Amino acid sequence: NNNIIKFDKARFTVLTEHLIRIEYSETGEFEERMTQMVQNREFSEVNFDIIEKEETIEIITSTVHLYYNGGEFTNASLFADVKFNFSVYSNRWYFGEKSDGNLKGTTRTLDMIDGECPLEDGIMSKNGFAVLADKGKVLTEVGDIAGNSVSTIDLYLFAYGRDYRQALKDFYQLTGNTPKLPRFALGNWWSRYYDYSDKSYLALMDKFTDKKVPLSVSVIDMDWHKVSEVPSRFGSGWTGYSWNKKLFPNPENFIDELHQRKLKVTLNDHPADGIRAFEDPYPQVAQTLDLNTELEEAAKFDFDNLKFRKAYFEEVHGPLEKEGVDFWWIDWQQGAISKSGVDPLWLLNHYQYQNAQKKHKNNIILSRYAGPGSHRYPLGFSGASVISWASLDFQPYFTSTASNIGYTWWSHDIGGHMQGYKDAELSLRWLQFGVFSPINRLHSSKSEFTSKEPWHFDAVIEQSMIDFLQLRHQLIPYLYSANLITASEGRALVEPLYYEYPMEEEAYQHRNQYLFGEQLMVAPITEKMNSLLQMGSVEVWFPEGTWYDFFSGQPYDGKVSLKVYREITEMPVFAKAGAIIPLDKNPLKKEEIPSEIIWKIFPGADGEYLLLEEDNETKAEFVNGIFTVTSKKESSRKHTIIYGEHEIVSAKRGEFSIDLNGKEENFDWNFSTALFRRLDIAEISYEQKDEILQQLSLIEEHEKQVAFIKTNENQELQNSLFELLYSGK
Amino acid sequence: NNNIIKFDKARFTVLTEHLIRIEYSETGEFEERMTQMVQNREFSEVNFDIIEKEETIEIITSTVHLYYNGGEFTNASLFADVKFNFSVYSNRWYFGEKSDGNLKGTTRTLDMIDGECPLEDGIMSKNGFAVLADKGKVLTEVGDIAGNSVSTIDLYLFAYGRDYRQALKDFYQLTGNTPKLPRFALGNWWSRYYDYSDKSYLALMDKFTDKKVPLSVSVIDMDWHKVSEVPSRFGSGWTGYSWNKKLFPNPENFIDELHQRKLKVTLNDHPADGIRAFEDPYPQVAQTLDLNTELEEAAKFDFDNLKFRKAYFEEVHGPLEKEGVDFWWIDWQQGAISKSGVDPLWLLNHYQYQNAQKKHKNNIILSRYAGPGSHRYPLGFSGASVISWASLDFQPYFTSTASNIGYTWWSHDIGGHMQGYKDAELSLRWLQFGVFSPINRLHSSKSEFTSKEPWHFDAVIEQSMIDFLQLRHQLIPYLYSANLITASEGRALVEPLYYEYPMEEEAYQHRNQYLFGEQLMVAPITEKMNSLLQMGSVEVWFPEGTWYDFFSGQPYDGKVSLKVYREITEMPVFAKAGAIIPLDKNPLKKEEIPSEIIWKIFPGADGEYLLLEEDNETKAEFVNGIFTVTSKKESSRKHTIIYGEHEIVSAKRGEFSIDLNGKEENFDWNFSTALFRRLDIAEISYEQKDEILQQLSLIEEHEKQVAFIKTNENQELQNSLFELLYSGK
Numbered sequence A, B: 001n002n003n004i005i006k007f008d009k010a011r012f013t014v015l016t017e018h019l020i021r022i023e024y025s026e027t028g029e030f031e032e033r034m035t036q037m038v039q040n041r042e043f044s045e046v047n048f049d050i051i052e053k054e055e056t057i058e059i060i061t062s063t064v065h066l067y068y069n070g071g072e073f074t075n076a077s078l079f080a081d082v083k084f085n086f087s088v089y090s091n092r093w094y095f096g097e098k099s100d101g102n103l104k105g106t107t108r109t110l111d112m113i114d115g116e117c118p119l120e121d122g123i124m125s126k127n128g129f130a131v132l133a134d135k136g137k138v139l140t141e142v143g144d145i146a147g148n149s150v151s152t153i154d155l156y157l158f159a160y161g162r163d164y165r166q167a168l169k170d171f172y173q174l175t176g177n178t179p180k181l182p183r184f185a186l187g188n189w190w191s192r193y194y195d196y197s198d199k200s201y202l203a204l205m206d207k208f209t210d211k212k213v214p215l216s217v218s219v220i221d222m223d224w225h226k227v228s229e230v231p232s233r234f235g236s237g238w239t240g241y242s243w244n245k246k247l248f249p250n251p252e253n254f255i256d257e258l259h260q261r262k263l264k265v266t267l268n269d270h271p272a273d274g275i276r277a278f279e280d281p282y283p284q285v286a287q288t289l290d291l292n293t294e295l296e297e298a299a300k301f302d303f304d305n306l307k308f309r310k311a312y313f314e315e316v317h318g319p320l321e322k323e324g325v326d327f328w329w330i331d332w333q334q335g336a337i338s339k340s341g342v343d344p345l346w347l348l349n350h351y352q353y354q355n356a357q358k359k360h361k362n363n364i365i366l367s368r369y370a371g372p373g374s375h376r377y378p379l380g381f382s383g384a385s386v387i388s389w390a391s392l393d394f395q396p397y398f399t400s401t402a403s404n405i406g407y408t409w410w411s412h413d414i415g416g417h418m419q420g421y422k423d424a425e426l427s428l429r430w431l432q433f434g435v436f437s438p439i440n441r442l443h444s445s446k447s448e449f450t451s452k453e454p455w456h457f458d459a460v461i462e463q464s465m466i467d468f469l470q471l472r473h474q475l476i477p478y479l480y481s482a483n484l485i486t487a488s489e490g491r492a493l494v495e496p497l498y499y500e501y502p503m504e505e506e507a508y509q510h511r512n513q514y515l516f517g518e519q520l521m522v523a524p525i526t527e528k529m530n531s532l533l534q535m536g537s538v539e540v541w542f543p544e545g546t547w548y549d550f551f552s553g554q555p556y557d558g559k560v561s562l563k564v565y566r567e568i569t570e571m572p573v574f575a576k577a578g579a580i581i582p583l584d585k586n587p588l589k590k591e592e593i594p595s596e597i598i599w600k601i602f603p604g605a606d607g608e609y610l611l612l613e614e615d616n617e618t619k620a621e622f623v624n625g626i627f628t629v630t631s632k633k634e635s636s637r638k639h640t641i642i643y644g645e646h647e648i649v650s651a652k653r654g655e656f657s658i659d660l661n662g663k664e665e666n667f668d669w670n671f672s673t674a675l676f677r678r679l680d681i682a683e684i685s686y687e688q689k690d691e692i693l694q695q696l697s698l699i700e701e702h703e704k705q706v707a708f709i710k711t712n713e714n715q716e717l718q719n720s721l722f723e724l725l726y727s728g729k
């Protein structure tokens, strides 16, 4: 190709104006095969310039000067200057050195993490460049490990500046796009490390129904298999492939009962102790792998071994899939050691994801992160977080930052996994976040005390949790459409603010704030409430424009940074003027696709929403106050329109238009009602409540209402009253 | 042997069902010679199974699967699964990797340590396996360094599960048993970094006699030799081999005076500056080593050099031994550097211990720990601890944990060495521990203010220290018998609780609690007293059974964890129902073996004690209330019997039996007396003392006495009163 340049023992491939592959080969042979990370090096031709001399070469694109002075790659021989001024003297890459600016990526797991842990770098940098080293093995055409690359150094220089979305799109072109998820993955999951019977598990699923809590997924954790019943001469019961017949005397019948309730079923698999002589599948595996059964030779875990993988999928997983298991929860915690040098977690995710496609279309796994490119094997499983406010306060930042290495389907244990402390408010705040996260999977530890069942908690917490769990199912149309946009266009569901606002310093100063699809901006509360206010809070950055609370219609004039206060039952979620959000009207109704959509419209601007579905596309347009709905294919779907406060159209079939210029634009939300509510719940003196209500009612000029609250001895009460005054300005 | 298997470049020796030697050789030659660590690879034949294929081998014992996949040893090629379920997924060893569970061992020294320091691993693990790498040089048949092993990797896989005692016994079979100590080592030692004269040292020894404090050992620290008198052109006076003639004008006469007082004599040796031209032995050493005397060439320390070692033992130590020095205090702090790569401390301990056997039977050294196997060279010398509560609080744990690498004769500076802070209670608590430690050596810094003389302190502290120092000599029969059991049976004097109680979680949660021989359980107090109670405390775990305070007879019903309180003059030491403890009746009497033994019997169960001595064995049996004493050889020894409270038999000669079924079983200890004493010393309100005494006297039901103390505003006073109520239940 003209986009390929050799010089000395190096090869440079200009993939885009902003993406250069850099290779070294001692043998003069360079690597064309795919790697664990890289699936495609076919990119459209681009323009660039070369200055080639006897001893040096310079490659010049629109955004980078790449220099190579010959010899072995060192910090002195291989380096690059970006054509940006984001920093005064951090604009140079040196081979093998770190520079400032990296916005980070993700890490394998949150196992045993109480609050923050270090993250690996991603491809995004405030200074406009990042290097992604390809240290993986080569693949065969069909995707097996083939051994060591002939490019003994193989790097990708990203020089996208602050065009983060294009960097991620081209990363997906290089490493392969995320596959489409199935719609069932986006609903509520039930999980608990608890020794249920068939009977008690079905009773709990029927209790969810009775309690008006929708579920898509039934997880069965490790007590599905033999645990205490494993003879100690075999080691532990952690690994198992044999049903506990006391708890599950007829597994296929039990899975049939979950399938009748329209649940997908996954089992915990701890693979590390392989298939030992006590297991139900051992006689078949022993025959296939020529094991010495009289010496009870174990089929040890070896995902480098083709015969072991086949016996694992066909003879261990196969019989359980035949009983009705839909997909695998790969729960690997036993290290990164293999003879090949390939991480066993990568071998599991790669081969299990491929194998899951045999029995179900667009099937998933649930497994820990296995390095760049492992987004090809959703879903991410973050693991055994400590139950704490600190863990919750880390998790929104963790989730949005992961988009910077393309790993956009993290499933966290909602409410935290293990250890830590009881606080029903922490559980409720964690579920609020979960509902506005990639995946909403309730899960917990082997404690008698850590169930995430809403009715574990008091009547107030229970009702709020049920409301949020129903909201998750209302959001499935929006989530599923965003899922198809991840798969087809390389856009993350969850974006850091700086994807949309790369030049706004405040977009880098609100770690836990994020965009959730294209219509919603989320600022989860992740700190225990101030007991004097009976409200939690978060500092929200409002970009330029008019914003509304998604739930209340409270307005906010951007651009501003403003501390916002919510009761424990309420979450800060915002939509711009012109936002259109579809909701399932019937979130409890078991049906493959919604028979009714609510179109929720935020007044004050034009807007547009495209609802992508399995077998349709539906466009909602809001232009000069006219709302139009069209679809590619006709259906019997009934549309409901909510314009600000008011239901305008109820259950209307087919394509249509309706003029909303005549209809009431304003939400009900008002300063006086909100003021009364905040004062009434506050654990402060009644004389202070009386004086604030009287003075804020009497004082007419906005600037003098603000001067009055500025005198308040309660600093946080000032900020809460200021939020109401700012919204009422 | 059938217990030897070769595969690829590896050799496996199945020494026991639970102990496998693992070797790699590039040359096809494997090492048969002893090493610094290993003295014996002769073990009885055991059964095991092999699965040998073209490319892999598996060795199977009762407790482990050892796997080798060929090639160089890596974490992927060499690994093992234990046949235990102590953990869920920590049951696998990977070559070159650490696993969880190791119960730790010991370290070189406590020099400069204020409280805790890190320890090396031992051979004991809660998860049931440990690997002991042999990185040492090979020895010749006579025990000189021979150079590098031909087994370039040489490992010992221990897979004993929680059979800790058998692991230690087989460790001693591999590395050699601890030698027998001489009886004199088990008495009190006097030491102080102080510039005594012959006259002032003998005056102090005569003051110990006048004060009723028995001593076995007189240590003379470095001011025995020239210090300030060394010309600075030679360096410091730290190393010296020349008596300071002002302080010791006739050394042999002074050592004769200590020998007449039945004291063994040791001198401090700082070897690192060798024999310089100012030293008294230099002319002889210079002649032997062909040194240039006109250029004052030093005989530099070089324990790799046979001629240097001979001149050191024969011409430097020899003349001092001829003046009467009994054994050497090797005080090495100058690093681990030698041309051979052997630690100079190991060369000193190995060669000096061997050389000490020439002039005295079962002789000792006193030196720092020199790695696994250095238990062959007792005694351990922990060195320059900081004088602090933190240092004392670490030291029982330090001492019992050392049994996990077989190093069972640690001698700590009792009361701490240097720096730190004055607190007479810390000195007293430290001496209590010392008396129930392997060796009771009083030692201190060059301060005018740090003498460990009991009469340094007030009358209360002095009398308590004298009482504990007399108790050490009462315990010499018990210590000496346990010493012969260490030497012959590989059982440590000091055991962690988990040796006796491996499956009790509480045996891992009382770091400072230990078994002291087979009849006593010690819980030293290592925290400053609560001034409101005038008592210190420690949480004691009482195993199943009936336990008695060794001193008071206070009873405790196991199994329970219970906070116990003692005045600063009293130490928590416990014996089970049926315990028999021999004591010297005449601890001040100078005699090679006791002319009278007290047999102290704890009622309520059968018991047995075997008193091993230099030239006898005496068995005390307590069966169905009959006490019998028999001996292998007749003697004129007089036996005293104390059954619980009461002396039954006084000074009875020969073998005999006596029925104690008719005699009073109960100790005097009673709730009311103990209650009055605790209230009386407490620095609390008299109205609280009055109310507690009155209410606990009046309230009859035990559960209501406990309910009354539960209302007390003083939390620690509750726990102290609860201990009395628990003992009185």
Ligand SMILES: OC[C@H]1O[C@H](O[C@@H]2[C@@H](O)[C@@H](O[C@@H]3[C@@H](O)[C@@H](O[C@@H]4[C@@H](O)[C@@H](O)O[C@H](CO)[C@H]4O)O[C@H](CO)[C@H]3O)O[C@H](CO)[C@H]2O)[C@H](O)[C@@H](O)[C@@H]1O
Pocket: A086, A087, A088, A089
């Ligand atoms: O010759 C000038 C000066 O250089 C050396 O000291 C520097 C020091 O004064 C200071 O300078 C920074 C600038 O680097 C520039 O930084 C911005 C930063 O403020 C922020 O806006 O973010 C951008 C983007 O990331 C930065 O690049 O301007 C600011 C003022 O706002 C100056 O403070 O810091 C740098 C880095 O530590 C120093 O190199 C020199 O030592 C000194 O003697 C001299 O006067």
Ligand SMILES: OC[C@H]1O[C@H](O[C@@H]2[C@@H](O)[C@@H](O[C@@H]3[C@@H](O)[C@@H](O[C@@H]4[C@@H](O)[C@@H](O)O[C@H](CO)[C@H]4O)O[C@H](CO)[C@H]3O)O[C@H](CO)[C@H]2O)[C@H](O)[C@@H](O)[C@@H]1O
Pocket: A112, A192, A193, A221, A222, A268, A331, A333, A383, A384, A417, A418, A444, A445, A446, A447, B086, B087, B088, B089
């Ligand atoms: O599939 C189950 C679970 O596995 C992963 O998370 C684990 C996490 O739930 C937790 O589990 C432990 C168990 O490991 C077991 O541990 C005991 C320990 O309690 C104690 O008794 O001492 C023994 C001996 O040393 C341990 O082996 O049982 C306890 C309950 O008492 C569980 O808490 O901790 C481990 C280790 O961190 C996790 O691997 C998985 O991430 C999770 O999603 C899943 O539900």
